[PDB]
Amino acid sequence: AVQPTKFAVTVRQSRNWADAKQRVIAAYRAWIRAAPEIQTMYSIPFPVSHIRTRIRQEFERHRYVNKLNVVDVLLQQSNADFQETMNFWRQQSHVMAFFKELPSNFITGFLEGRN
Amino acid sequence: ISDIHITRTGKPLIRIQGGRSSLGEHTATVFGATGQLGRYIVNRLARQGCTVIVPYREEMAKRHLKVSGDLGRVIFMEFDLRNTQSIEESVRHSDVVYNLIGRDYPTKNFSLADVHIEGTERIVEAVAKYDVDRFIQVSTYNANPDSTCEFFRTKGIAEKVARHVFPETTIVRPAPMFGFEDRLLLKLASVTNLFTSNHMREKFWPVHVNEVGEALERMLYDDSTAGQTFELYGPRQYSMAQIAELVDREIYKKRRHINLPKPILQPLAELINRVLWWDTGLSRDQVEREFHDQVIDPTAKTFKDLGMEPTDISKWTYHYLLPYRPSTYYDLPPSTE
Amino acid sequence: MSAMSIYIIFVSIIAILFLAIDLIFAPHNPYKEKLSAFECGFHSFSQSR
Amino acid sequence: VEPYPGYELRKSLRKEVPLPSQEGTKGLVQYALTTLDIITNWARQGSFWPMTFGLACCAVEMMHLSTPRYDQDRLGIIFRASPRQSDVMIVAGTLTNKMAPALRQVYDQMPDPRWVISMGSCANGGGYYHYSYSVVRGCDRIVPVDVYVPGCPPTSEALMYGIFQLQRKMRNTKITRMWYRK
Amino acid sequence: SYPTRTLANLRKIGLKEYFRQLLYIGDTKYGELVGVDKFGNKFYENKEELPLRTRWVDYAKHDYDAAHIEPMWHAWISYQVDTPPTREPLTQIERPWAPKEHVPNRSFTRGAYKPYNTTQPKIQSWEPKAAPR
Amino acid sequence: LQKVEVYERIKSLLAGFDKVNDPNNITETAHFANDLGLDSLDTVEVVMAIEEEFSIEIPDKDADQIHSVDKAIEYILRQPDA
Numbered sequence: 001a002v003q004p005t006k007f008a009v010t011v012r013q014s015r016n017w018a019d020a021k022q023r024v025i026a027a028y029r030a031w032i033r034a035a036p037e038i039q040t041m042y043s044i045p046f047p048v049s050h051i052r053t054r055i056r057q058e059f060e061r062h063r064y065v066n067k068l069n070v071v072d073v074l075l076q077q078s079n080a081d082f083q084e085t086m087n088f089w090r091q092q093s094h095v096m097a098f099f100k101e102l103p104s105n106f107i108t109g110f111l112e113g114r115n
Numbered sequence: 116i117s118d119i120h121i122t123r124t125g126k127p128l129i130r131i132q133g134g135r136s137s138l139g140e141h142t143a144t145v146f147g148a149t150g151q152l153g154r155y156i157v158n159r160l161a162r163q164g165c166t167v168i169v170p171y172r173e174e175m176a177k178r179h180l181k182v183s184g185d186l187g188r189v190i191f192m193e194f195d196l197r198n199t200q201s202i203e204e205s206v207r208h209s210d211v212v213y214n215l216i217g218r219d220y221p222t223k224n225f226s227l228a229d230v231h232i233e234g235t236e237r238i239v240e241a242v243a244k245y246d247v248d249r250f251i252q253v254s255t256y257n258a259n260p261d262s263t264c265e266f267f268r269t270k271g272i273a274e275k276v277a278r279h280v281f282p283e284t285t286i287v288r289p290a291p292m293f294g295f296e297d298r299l300l301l302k303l304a305s306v307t308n309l310f311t312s313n314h315m316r317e318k319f320w321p322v323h324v325n326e327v328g329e330a331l332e333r334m335l336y337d338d339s340t341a342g343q344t345f346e347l348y349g350p351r352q353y354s355m356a357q358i359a360e361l362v363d364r365e366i367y368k369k370r371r372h373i374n375l376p377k378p379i380l381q382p383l384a385e386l387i388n389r390v391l392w393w394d395t396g397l398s399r400d401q402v403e404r405e406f407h408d409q410v411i412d413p414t415a416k417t418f419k420d421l422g423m424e425p426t427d428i429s430k431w432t433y434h435y436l437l438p439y440r441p442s443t444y445y446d447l448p449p450s451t452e
Numbered sequence: 453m454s455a456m457s458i459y460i461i462f463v464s465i466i467a468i469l470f471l472a473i474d475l476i477f478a479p480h481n482p483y484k485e486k487l488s489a490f491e492c493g494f495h496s497f498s499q500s501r
Numbered sequence: 502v503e504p505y506p507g508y509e510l511r512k513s514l515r516k517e518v519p520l521p522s523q524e525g526t527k528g529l530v531q532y533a534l535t536t537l538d539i540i541t542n543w544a545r546q547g548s549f550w551p552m553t554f555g556l557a558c559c560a561v562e563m564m565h566l567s568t569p570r571y572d573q574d575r576l577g578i579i580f581r582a583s584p585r586q587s588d589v590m591i592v593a594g595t596l597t598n599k600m601a602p603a604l605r606q607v608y609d610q611m612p613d614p615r616w617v618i619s620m621g622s623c624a625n626g627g628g629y630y631h632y633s634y635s636v637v638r639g640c641d642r643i644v645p646v647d648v649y650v651p652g653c654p655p656t657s658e659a660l661m662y663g664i665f666q667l668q669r670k671m672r673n674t675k676i677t678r679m680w681y682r683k
Numbered sequence: 684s685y686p687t688r689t690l691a692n693l694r695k696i697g698l699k700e701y702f703r704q705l706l707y708i709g710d711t712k713y714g715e716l717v718g719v720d721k722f723g724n725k726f727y728e729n730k731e732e733l734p735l736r737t738r739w740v741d742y743a744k745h746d747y748d749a750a751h752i753e754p755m756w757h758a759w760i761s762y763q764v765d766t767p768p769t770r771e772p773l774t775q776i777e778r779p780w781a782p783k784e785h786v787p788n789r790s791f792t793r794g795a796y797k798p799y800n801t802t803q804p805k806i807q808s809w810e811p812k813a814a815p816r
Numbered sequence: 817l818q819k820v821e822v823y824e825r826i827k828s829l830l831a832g833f834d835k836v837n838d839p840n841n842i843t844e845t846a847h848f849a850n851d852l853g854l855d856s857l858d859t860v861e862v863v864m865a866i867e868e869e870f871s872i873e874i875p876d877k878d879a880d881q882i883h884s885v886d887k888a889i890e891y892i893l894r895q896p897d898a
């Protein structure tokens with residue numbers, strides 16, 4: 001067959017919640033380990049602290065998931081997004097599209113038009 | 116800021132906000148927009164769906180501006196300063212006129228007095244003639260009709276001419292600007308800028324050009340900014356020596372300069388400017404400004420009056436100077452020293 | 453003076469005269485993306501050194 | 502009262518000057534600066550090298566200009582692979598969002614003077630894929646465009662007609678007389 | 684061109700025309716006149732020529748452009764018809780609304796077409812009438 | 817390396833972390849979760865910070881084991897890099 005690429009990971013299902021628990025930590029660790037390496041690959045002018053902050057928030061939005069089959073789709077997406085980033089397939093515009101650098105009240109929203 | 120803007124002549128503007136396909140409702144004219152500042156004001160106005168007239172001289176140097184806006188949004192008009200008709204044809208559909216026309220050095224057909232006083236005279240007289248709502252003229256820092264530097268004097272007299280003709284002029288005084296394609300950071304990283312009269316010890320409060328284009332955008336929406344005078348300067352004071360220190364730390368090159376005595380350099384600089392056709396950075400008055408120091412004239416509004424807090428030049432050295440790092444040090448992270 | 457010595461001079465002045473024209477009468481507008489390495493349109497790892 | 506002492510008196514006498522399209526050589530200096538413009542533009546016209554870059558089927562009609570019927574070389578037009586040796590980029594194909602960084606990167610890497618020809622409805626305004634989730638609605642959201650050729654595909658001759666427009670634009674481009682106005 | 688053809692054509696047309704043709708067509712062509720545009724363009728035919736070269740145009744203007752060819756002749760130069768607009772009946776239907784003058788491609792000039800809305804706005808706002816108190 | 821040397825730098829780093837409940841609770845036998853108030857992701861960041869400071873790579877199997885300061889000290893001595 002054709003060779004899987006450098007960070008290609010075989011798609012496998014989580015055995016139990018302990019499996020998923022350990023994989024999510026492995027994925028979060030691997031992301032924040034790579035933040036210094038992302039910065040010089042993509043010439044990020046922000047410091048690495050901001051990059052790791054964004055990694056933390058992406059993981060935090062899936063914090064309250066209690067379904068193995070939703071976590072494994074999520075562990076799939078991060079694996080592909082990690083592989084995509086580390087092999088430098090995406091470019092600076094894609095990585096900067098990921099950093100964003102709604103009205104806070106009804107009355108603020110009303111006065112400007114909806115938002 | 117709202118969905119309704121009401122102008123000085125009283126016309127309402129019912130706006131749809133986002134994107135280049137929407138309705139910004141404002142028809143602007145930006146004189147001097149093919150320079151360095153001019154793109155940032157034009158991109159800001161155009162990408163929010165406003166019609167922008169761009170008076171130009173050389174056809175091929177205006178072309179980057181059309182990408183800013185949708186179809187029919189950015190209108191190019193070919194004009195000359197001494198062609199009053201082309202000036203009048205360019206401002207008469209407009210509710211705001213930006214005057215960004217300036218030149219650091221004299222030319223064989225324009226003195227500093229001719230491009231600043233007379234150019235502003237025609238532009239402002241057309242603003243008065245067709246009753247355009249807003250007129251944001253951009254002067255320089257240290258502008259003074261009593262000055263002796265031709266730059267700071269002539270841009271100081273055009274300030275008074277504009278008010279005398281159109282009193283609601285928003286007068287904007289930026290400090291020396293840094294940014295992409297700036298004549299501040301890119302010259303200190305260059306190799307042509309070797310001559311110098313002082314020891315690069317003149318001080319100023321450098322300001323991001325990106326934050327000045329944003330400031331000019333906010334003056335259009337804050338109608339109360341009309342008839343005011345704005346000095347737009349940065350958060351810190353530096354010398355040319357402190358700025359050049361940052362550049363060397365970033366490009367990793369350790370640039371050097373040849374200092375000359377002003378009674379010697381100034382005559383030569385007036386010869387290079389008179390014998391070469393390109394902007395050489397050297398001229399009799401640019402040497403005179405070289406020995407002058409920036410003063411923030413009080414009773415003048417600031418970035419805070421637009422509700423904006425400028426960022427320091429140090430945070431921007433990596434972004435803009437990285438093209439000038441040698442291959443050995445290029446892969447390194449930003450200095451952040 | 454000998455034909456060889458002048459021959460060397462003329463080929464070098466031609467290498468200079470052609471070079472000097474381009475160094476003077478051509479536009480020079482260097483920016484970050486214009487000054488990047490060519491890699492068919494995508495930036496890659498810099499590993500030629 | 503007046504701002505500066507000469508105001509309201511110097512205003513009477515002013516030099517209203519014709520625009521660059523409204524001018525002609527009058528002296529020796531205008532004659533010599535036109536002649537340099539002639540010899541400069543004649544070279545840009547006669548050595549017209551487009552990048553060998555093409556995205557889809559419009560490139561098929563584009564490479565038919567290099568073939569014996571039209572023999573694009575008979576006019577001095579040879580396709581160079583590198584953007585460093587190219588004068589003109591012809592956008593002959595659909596610009597997807599995945600390709601837009603690469604089109605922009607090779608355009609930036611093309612030296613001055615440089616021109617862009619947009620060939621085809623897709624590069625003009627997105628064409629048949631205008632309502633797609635992956636298509637840039639016209640290459641001029643990405644790069645500035647000097648001449649637009651209609652058709653899907655434009656015939657080999659239609660592209661030649663747009664290259665003849667661009668050379669006619671070069672031939673009327675004022676280079677050395679532009680500096681003489683500033 | 685080849686020596687037998689070029690000398691034969693050169694003999695027929697004369698040296699002065701030979702150099703004029705080396706300036707515009709860059710070829711040396713001889714043929715019989717078939718007609719003239721409303722713009723002054725001249726059309727020749729010679730069936731004793733290589734395929735797709737038996738019909739050609741001598742452009743009236745020095746700054747010659749392909750869009751200077753009148754519509755009916757645009758079909759004849761394109762081998763889309765064989766009967767020339769001199770002998771073609773559809774060039775006789777009187778249309779008082781037809782352009783009397785020559786209307787070429789107007790791009791890159793100030794006569795370039797500018798598009799616009801041909802329709803009125805879709806919603807009309809109230810003209811306020813503040814009745815006296 | 818020296819045990820006191822490989823512990824002094826940890827206290828500065830741990831106190832330097834933004835949102836520990838209080839810098840006094842750091843001891844030689846303190847737990848990240850029970851004492852220092854660090855959740856799963858905070859603890860993974862702390863091992864990540866420790867590895868960067870000591871210029872060593874901490875593998876997935878033994879990275880999980882470091883839930884307390886003493887475990888970090890023993891691993892740092894065990895791994896031969898500084």
Ligand SMILES: NC(=O)C1=CN([C@@H]2O[C@H](COP(=O)(O)OP(=O)(O)OC[C@H]3O[C@@H](n4cnc5c(N)ncnc54)[C@H](OP(=O)(O)O)[C@@H]3O)[C@@H](O)[C@H]2O)C=CC1
Pocket residue numbers: 146147148149150151152153171172173195196214215216217218219225230253254255256289290291292293298683
């Ligand atoms: N940048 C800075 O550090 C500072 C700038 N300023 C002022 O800010 C304004 C914008 O700055 P910046 O964009 O950097 O300046 P640039 O010099 O880059 O741009 C000046 C503009 O003025 C136009 N112009 C100059 N002379 C003439 C003339 N005689 N006739 C017609 N147009 C003319 C130029 O058009 P063209 O390109 O066609 O010649 C250009 O678009 C200027 O007025 C400048 O003096 C003041 C303080 C600091």
Ligand SMILES: *P(=O)(O)OCC(C)(C)[C@H](O)C(=O)NCCC(=O)NCCSC(=O)CCCCCCCCCCCCC
Pocket residue numbers: 021024025031038054055058059060062063064065071074075077078081085095098855856857
């Ligand atoms: P502790 O017991 O508190 O354990 C914490 C965790 C998070 C494990 C939770 O308790 C938990 O089990 N919750 C459910 C699992 C979960 O949080 N999410 C599933 C993991 S996949 C995921 O979250 C992917 C996030 C997005 C992709 C990775 C982040 C990086 C994106 C790109 C960064 C920058 C690139 C330019």
Ligand code: SF4
Pocket residue numbers: 557558559560593594595620621622623624628629652653654655
């Ligand atoms: S314009 Fe037509 S021929 Fe050209 S690439 Fe698009 S679909 Fe294909």
